[PDB]
């Protein structure tokens, strides 16, 4: 009569590495490395993202003629740009503090697009119907941004304009605009006459002034002229005044929004579906259960610390030594 004390064994093939020895076959293990995803762009915390498709942030906000589906944009928890996101500033120029704007508009609660300065009578004694370029073509036709208005000259007179707007939207307003910079002084005058013009934007929290910086420069996608784009967040109850003698690509539409926090811009060509997720990446949604992940260094949300590891398997059972 004998009794033996021993331990369990099974058909397990799981192997873990230990301080003293590699690939030790163990009976039971748990994985601590999330390395699989769903190749889908999900809703981050129950709030789908914003797809820009062929357009990029600049094209979307400015009103590039190719981003018309984006004129209804609403909610979104993070912005998605594609490898096709190329419709931006159809008219050459620097989008001032662009990175900064992209970063701040990452996450938005509400976002209403309203006509801040109506084209139809808002610019008396000023040409508001010529501001159309070929660089910004809309179906073969020459067009322009849908949120900005290119104010040209009335016949042969360009008087000093001065429109103010006070944000009574009960939330912040994103006002965008531009300053045109003719190549010479022949265009400078043929468009705004006053060869010495200026544009000044004033707010209780803003005051930078401008003057066209005419100069010779290479034509880009058509024009040798240039348009710098400027934006600003107008606090509630504050007033922003615009006034110029020329070179002002005035705001037509502004956005009334409610920023809650800030995420980022996922740029991937992966499909967007009605799935959810606490952590999102370019290749797809990641699980937020394990303490580490190796799917992508760039992630948005509450994510597992990214690591270069390929295997982080933890033993739970004992060494496996079968054979009967």
């Amino acid at each position: 009569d004998t009794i033996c004390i021993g331990y369990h064994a099974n058909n397990s093939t799981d192997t873990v590495d230990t301080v003293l020895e590699k690939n030790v076959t163990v009976t039971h293990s748990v994985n601590l490395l999330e390395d699989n995803h769903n190749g889908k762009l999900c809703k981050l915390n129950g709030i789908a993202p914003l797809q820009l498709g062929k357009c990029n942030v600049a094209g979307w906000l400015l009103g590039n003629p190719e981003c018309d589906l984006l004129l209804t944009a609403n909610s979104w928890s993070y912005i998605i740009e594609t490898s096709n996101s190329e419709n931006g500033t159809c008219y050459p120029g620097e989008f001032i503090d662009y990175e900064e704007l992209r970063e701040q508009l990452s996450s938005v609660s509400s976002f209403e697009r309203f006509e801040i300065f109506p084209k139809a009578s808002s610019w008396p004694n000023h040409e508001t119907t010529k501001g159309v370029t070929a660089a910004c073509s809309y179906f073969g036709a020459s067009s322009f941004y849908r949120n900005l208005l290119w104010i040209t000259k009335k016949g042969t007179s360009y008087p000093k304009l001065s429109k103010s707007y006070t944000n009574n939207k009960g939330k912040e307003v994103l006002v965008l605009w531009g300053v045109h910079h003719p190549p010479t002084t022949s265009e400078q005058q043929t468009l705004y006459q006053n060869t010495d013009a200026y544009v000044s934007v004033g707010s209780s929290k803003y005051n930078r002034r401008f003057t066209p910086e005419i100069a010779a420069r290479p034509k880009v996608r058509g024009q040798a002229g240039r348009m710098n784009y400027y934006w600003t967040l107008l606090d509630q109850g504050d007033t922003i005044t615009f006034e110029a003698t020329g070179n002002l690509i005035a705001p037509w539409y502004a956005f009334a929004l409610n920023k809650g926090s800030d995420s980022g811009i996922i740029t991937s060509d992966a499909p967007v579906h009605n799935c959810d997720t606490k952590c999102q990446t370019p290749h797809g949604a990641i699980n937020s259960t394990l303490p580490f992940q190796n799917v992508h260094p760039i992630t948005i949300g509450e994510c597992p610390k990214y690591v270069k590891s390929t295997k982080l398997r933890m033993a739970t059972g004992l060494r496996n030594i079968p054979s009967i």
Partner: protein, 160 residues
């Protein structure tokens, strides 16, 4: 292992024992078979379970957007951002890698220790009434029926 029981003086595992991690196997005139020690197995589970939880539960993460976007005249802060990303991702790689390696060594030892304490738990009761065969087995100098086999399992083996 560190306690000589696993793949040590009890060099093999029991495919036959399927109801627990550590346990027994008896053989008497009445028959034979395995019986996992439920207590030490349960306790081991609770511990390994609690251990995995800690390694996972203690990992705090807030809502973050790793990416940044810097323009061609911001290479320095872009490289600083890089340094931060590579920095943390070097700390978490070395840490995670070793946390596992080290904790794996600890879990196997733990199991080994549990087996050695069980084998020792028994050696204690049997004393003179059995001879040790260096393989984790005891051979009663007397007859030990199923009740007697049971008694040692539930730690109540008589006059030794």
């Amino acid at each position: 292992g560190l306690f000589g029981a696993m793949a040590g003086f009890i060099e093999g595992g029991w495919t036959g024992m399927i109801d627990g991690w550590y346990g027994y196997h008896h053989q008497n005139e009445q028959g034979s078979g395995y019986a996992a020690d439920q207590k030490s197995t349960q306790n081991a589970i609770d511990g390994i379970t609690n251990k995995v939880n800690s390694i996972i539960e203690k990992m705090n993460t807030q809502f973050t957007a790793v990416g940044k976007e810097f323009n061609n005249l911001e290479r320095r802060i872009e490289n600083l951002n890089k340094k931060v990303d590579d920095g943390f991702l070097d700390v978490w790689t070395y840490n995670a890698e070793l946390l596992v390696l080290l904790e794996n060594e600890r879990t196997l030892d733990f199991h080994d220790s549990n087996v050695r304490n069980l084998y020792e738990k028994v050696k204690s009761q049997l004393r003179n009434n059995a001879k040790e065969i260096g393989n984790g087995c005891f051979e009663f100098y007397h007859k030990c029926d199923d009740e007697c086999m049971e008694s040692v399992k539930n730690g109540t083996y008589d006059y030794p």
